[PDB]
């Protein structure tokens, strides 16, 4: 389709009016009130740092996670490789209307009239080998290397995801022994599912006009973002309204808290609104690794998160139910969280 590589300007179909409505501030370590929080997952005070970041930002940089740097670099190379394929091959794996996986813009794109300056690809790690055969129907080197790197990455990330979930629950102020009780009763970590979305943001000749990824919250529990060392992720903060530019830090993931975790925590942990901007000089690739419940599980505020005497702030919803609420929210200009809230 549209050739991002050849465009010498951004055409009106790809031009967004609002983009500088709010100021952008630096979120590096010298950024003050707006330095993005960093959490070292192996530090003894990780739970406390996760608490503060989840409450005040809904996001944090994550270091010390143990995922080998050599593996992360191979992941980024494979991801770049998918998007350097010819258009004709990519379209062989197109994600058709309403389909969950394949090559194409993510589902938020269909709700907006202007088009994003990026490409995407969604797959589920649990059926990676079969899904990726749509892209490489005769298998071969690129296919086998891609599946090998993504399989190993999924094994490391699913473990990290279980470690982070335990930290998030501790960060509600529960002891390790109480968290074990929650996990034993609800099996949240045992049951959560992972989905991957790959993003390619090509260089853009008029960055003030184009938008890499439409501003949104993630719908699920929480997401790990792995990105090339080119900046572009921005996190919205209020009072006053502003975008915080997340720094590109070697060996960090960014964790974003999503809507269903806002529900799970009775509103305690913020679901972060975020977007990705393009840039003039460098392409960059990112991968989101999205955690959420299985399709049959109801998500409602945890009793341990609801203060004593108080009522739950949100109704119970399954993820498929909540996706329908999101779709309605996108069309009507509303907020899916408000729509399932008890007020
Ligand atoms: C598991 C997921 C999570 C999805 C839906 C599905 C696959 C792709 C994910 C994203 C990725 C990009 C933006 C978002 C808002 C989108 O449009 O697609 C995300 C969405 C969500 O957070 O709900
Ligand atoms: O590309 C980024 O840094 C944003 C990733 C993200 O927001 C997503 O893919 O949902």
How does this model look, in words?
- The protein is of the alpha+beta class and 343 residues long.
- The protein has a single domain (12-340), classed as Sandwich (Jelly Rolls).
- The chain is 31% helix and 18% strand.
- It is built from 10 helices and 13 strands.
- It has helices at 46-56, 69-84, 87-90, 128-131, 141-170, 176-186, 188-191, 259-264, 319-332, 336-340; strands at 24-26, 38-40, 59-63, 102-103, 119-123, 193-201, 213-216, 222-227, 233-237, 242-245, 253-257, 274-276, 284-292.
- Bound molecules: Gibberellin A9 and 2-oxoglutaric acid (AKG).
- 2-oxoglutaric acid binds at residues 197, 199, 213, 218, 225, 227, 233, 274, 276, 286, 288.
- Keywords: Dioxygenase, Iron, Metal-binding, Oxidoreductase.
Helices and strands in order, then pairings?
Elements: E1 24-26, E2 38-40, H1 46-56, E3 59-63, H2 69-84, H3 87-90, E4 102-103, E5 119-123, H4 128-131, H5 141-170, H6 176-186, H7 188-191, E6 193-201, E7 213-216, E8 222-227, E9 233-237, E10 242-245, E11 253-257, H8 259-264, E12 274-276, E13 284-292, H9 319-332, H10 336-340
Parallel strand pairs: 1-10, 2-3
Antiparallel strand pairs: 3-11, 4-5, 5-6, 6-13, 7-12, 8-11, 8-13, 9-10, 9-12
Helix pairs in contact: 1-5, 2-5
């Amino acid at each position: 389709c549209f050739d991002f590589r050849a465009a010498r300007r951004v055409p009106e179909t790809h031009a967004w009016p609002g983009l500088d409505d709010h100021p952008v501030v630096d979120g590096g370590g010298g950024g003050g009130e707006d330095a993005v929080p960093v959490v070292d997952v192996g530090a003894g005070d990780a739970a406390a740092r996760v608490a503060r970041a989840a409450e005040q930002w809904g996001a944090f940089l994550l270091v010390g996670h143990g995922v080998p740097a050599a593996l992360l670099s191979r992941v980024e190379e494979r991801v770049a490789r998918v998007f350097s394929l010819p258009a004709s091959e990519k379209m062989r794996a197109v994600r058709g209307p309403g389909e969950p996986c394949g090559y194409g813009s993510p589902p938020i794109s269909s709700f907006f009239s202007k088009l994003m300056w990026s490409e995407g690809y969604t797959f589920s790690p649990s059926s990676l080998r079969s899904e990726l055969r749509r892209l490489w129907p005769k298998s071969g080197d690129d296919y086998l290397l891609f599946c090998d790197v993504m399989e190993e990455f999924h094994k490391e990330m699913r473990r990290l995801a279980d470690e982070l979930l335990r930290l998030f629950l501790r960060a509600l102020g529960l002891t390790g022994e109480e968290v074990a009780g929650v996990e034993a009763e609800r099996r949240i970590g045992e049951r959560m599912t992972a989905t991957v979305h790959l993003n390619w943001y090509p260089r853009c000749p008029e960055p003030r006009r184009a938008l890499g990824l439409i501003a949104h919250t993630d719908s699920g529990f929480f997401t790990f973002v792995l990105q090339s060392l080119v900046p572009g992720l921005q996190l919205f903060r209020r009072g006053p309204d502003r975008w915080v530019a997340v720094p590109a830090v070697a060996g960090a993931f960014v964790v974003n808290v999503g809507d269903l975790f806002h529900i799970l925590t009775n509103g305690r942990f913020h679901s972060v609104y975020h977007r990705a901007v393009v840039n003039r000089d460098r392409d960059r690739v990112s991968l989101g690794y999205f955690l959420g419940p299985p399709p049959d599980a109801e998500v409602a505020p945890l009793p341990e998160a609801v203060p004593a005497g108080r009522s739950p702030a949100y109704r119970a919803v399954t993820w498929p139910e909540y996706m329908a609420v999101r779709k309605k929210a996108f069309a009507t200009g509303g907020s899916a969280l408000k729509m399932v809230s008890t007020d």
